[PDB]
Write a protein that binds this ligand. Structure first.
Ligand SMILES: CC(C)CCC[C@@H](C)[C@H]1CC[C@H]2[C@@H]3CC=C4C[C@@H](O)CC[C@]4(C)[C@H]3CC[C@]12C
Ligand SMILES: CCCCCCCC/C=C\CCCCCCCC(=O)OC[C@H](O)CO
Ligand SMILES: CCCCCCCC/C=C\CCCCCCCC(=O)OC[C@H](O)CO
Ligand SMILES: CCCCCCCC/C=C\CCCCCCCC(=O)OC[C@H](O)CO
Ligand SMILES: CCCCCCCC/C=C\CCCCCCCC(=O)O
Ligand SMILES: CCCCCCCC/C=C\CCCCCCCC(=O)O
Ligand SMILES: C=CCc1ccccc1OC[C@@H](O)CNC(C)C
Length: 440
């Protein structure tokens, strides 16, 4: 009766992997906005999962339920070679993603890959050619084969497909195929998360706090705004707001502006906020006493409220100058501004308290993209590392291997081929593609 329940659960795992990855591949294959360098590697990853879901996981399920191998010794060696290829290719692709994200964040381009689609295609094809060679040749040439009697009996028997390996292979294949790219991926992507946080500036901080709209909108007070929190007029007239817009840009806008035009106004307003601080006798000394991070928090306040407005916080500024952060924070919380925009205020106040970008952590869309890619990496590790740790331990220790524990932990890694599509539901671009392909 256990076999029935086990059979259903296993069928749904197969179905969840297949449609899940087919959906992801179809989304990148058809939607123009999703044909990026990062998404080409995501396709390489989704292919390995689809291959795992169609050629590995179904035959694995059959081996458990029938308690025997009914496909012969040739498909057994081939099946094992494909499985290892899928794991090796999946982790090497995740390592490439990490290295590519590093080179991007360390470049002036910041979020765009330095690789071209042609180069990325070659990188992907080289990963599969190398992973194919490292995974098929030691299995086909029988370099993996153990010398103990129980293994030889399993090799000769056409109804035995128990992955018996010699200690050397179980160490060599594990290091080259998994541990080496994992160590590099974890070490490199921790630096990408570091650079994203360290390279956070006032412009990024304000694009988070104010947002971006190329259409005229009303703020909390009700004043007409455009771009990144650029107030057009205090007048309650759309024509009055459109006139000030046409005058500022220097063309017939009709209430709509370009991304290039939005950045133009933004660089002007930020520049005006910094200029205003230096001409203000009450803000200029506070600006000098502050560090790089806390200067942005003061520029942020002058951007939102204005030179005169911020200069009104005589008590708060005094303690910012005296470097008494926690004390300044209470007086900043005890204000009209904190009540008006509490989410934005809390962030700026935390910046003044901590002196770090911790409040603006993964708030930018480009930063959320790094988090999404970081989740994909982290899950793969949590799913495969227990199998690989218990694998390398039962090589040195020799005992406590079991079949029950080995297959179970291998299936923890198998279930991962169905998780990646669910994690892509974080990206709005993928979400928009999925609902279109599913007609919702
Ligand atoms: C089991 C073995 C024999 C089959 C392996 C499947 C191979 C053919 C698949 C898996 C991953 C695939 C790649 C995934 C990513 C891309 C990006 C896309 O923009 C062009 C094609 C390209 C470069 C694919 C080519 C074919 C590919 C290398
Ligand atoms: C067997 C699985 C077949 C999957 C192999 C399909 C790879 C093609 C692909 O995903 O790429 C989309 C398109 O070519 C990019 O512009
Ligand atoms: C180790 C794996 C390294 C894989 C190489 C990734 C390619 C890359 O990140 O790009 C480098 C840069 O763009 C220069 O061309
Ligand atoms: C499920 C857990 C996935 C682990 C991935 C991870 O740790 O995420 C990194 C990021 O820094 C988290 O904010
Ligand atoms: C057994 C084979 C099961 C599933 C693989 C076939 C799914 C491919 C459908 C492609 C449709 C499309 O163009 O999006
Ligand atoms: C070790 C190889 C890591 C090379 C990638 C550079 C990233 C880094 O310097 O942290
Ligand atoms: C020899 C250790 C296992 C191994 C090493 C390197 C790369 C992949 C590896 O194995 C992944 C497993 O999914 C294999 N599963 C068997 C075929 C049931």
């Amino acid at each position: 009766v256990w076999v029935v329940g086990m059979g259903i659960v296993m069928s749904l795992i197969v179905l969840a992997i297949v449609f899940g990855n087919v959906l992801v591949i179809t989304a990148i294959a058809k939607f123009e906005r999703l044909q990026t360098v990062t998404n080409y590697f995501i396709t390489s990853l989704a292919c390995a999962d689809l291959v795992m879901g169609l050629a590995v996981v179904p035959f694995g399920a059959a081996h458990i339920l029938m308690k025997m191998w009914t496909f012969g010794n040739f498909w057994c060696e081939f099946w094992t070679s494909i499985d290892v290829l899928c794991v090796t290719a999946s982790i090497w692709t995740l390592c490439v993603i990490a290295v590519d994200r590093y080179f991007a964040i360390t470049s002036p381009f910041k979020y765009q890959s330095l690789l071209t689609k042609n180069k990325a295609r070659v990188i992907i094809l080289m990963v599969w050619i190398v992973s194919g060679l490292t995974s098929f040749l030691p299995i086909q040439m029988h370099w993996y084969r153990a010398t103990h009697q129980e293994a030889i009996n399993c090799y000769a028997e056409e109804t035995c497909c128990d992955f018996f390996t010699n200690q050397a292979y179980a160490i060599a294949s594990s290091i080259v195929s998994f541990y080496v790219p994992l160590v590099i991926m974890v070490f490199v992507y921790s630096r990408v998360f570091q650079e994203a946080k360290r390279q956070l500036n006032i412009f990024e901080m304000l694009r988070i706090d104010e947002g971006l709209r190329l259409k005229i909108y009303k703020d909390t007070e009700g004043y007409y705004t455009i771009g990144i929190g650029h107030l057009l007029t205090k007048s309650p007239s759309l024509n009055a707001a459109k006139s000030e817009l046409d005058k500022a840009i220097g063309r017939n806008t009709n209430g709509v502006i370009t991304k290039d035009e939005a950045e133009k106004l933004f660089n002007q307003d930020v520049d005006a906020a910094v200029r205003g601080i230096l001409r203000n006798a009450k803000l200029k000394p506070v600006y000098d006493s502050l560090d790089a991070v806390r200067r942005a928090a003061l520029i942020n306040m002058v951007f939102q409220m204005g030179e005169t407005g911020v200069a009104g916080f005589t008590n708060s500024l005094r303690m910012l100058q005296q470097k008494r952060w926690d004390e300044a924070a209470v007086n900043l919380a005890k204000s009209r501004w904190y009540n008006q925009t509490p989410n934005r205020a809390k962030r700026v106040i935390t910046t003044f308290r901590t002196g770090t970008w911790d409040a603006y952590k993964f708030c930018l869309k480009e930063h959320k993209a790094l988090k999404t890619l970081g989740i994909i990496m982290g899950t793969f590790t949590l799913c495969w590392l227990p199998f690989f740790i218990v694998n390398i331990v039962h090589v040195i220790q020799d005992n406590l291997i079991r079949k029950e524990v080995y297959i179970l932990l291998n299936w923890i890694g198998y279930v991962n081929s169905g998780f990646n599509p669910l994690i892509y539901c974080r990206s709005p671009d993928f979400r928009i593609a999925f609902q279109e392909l599913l007609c919702l």
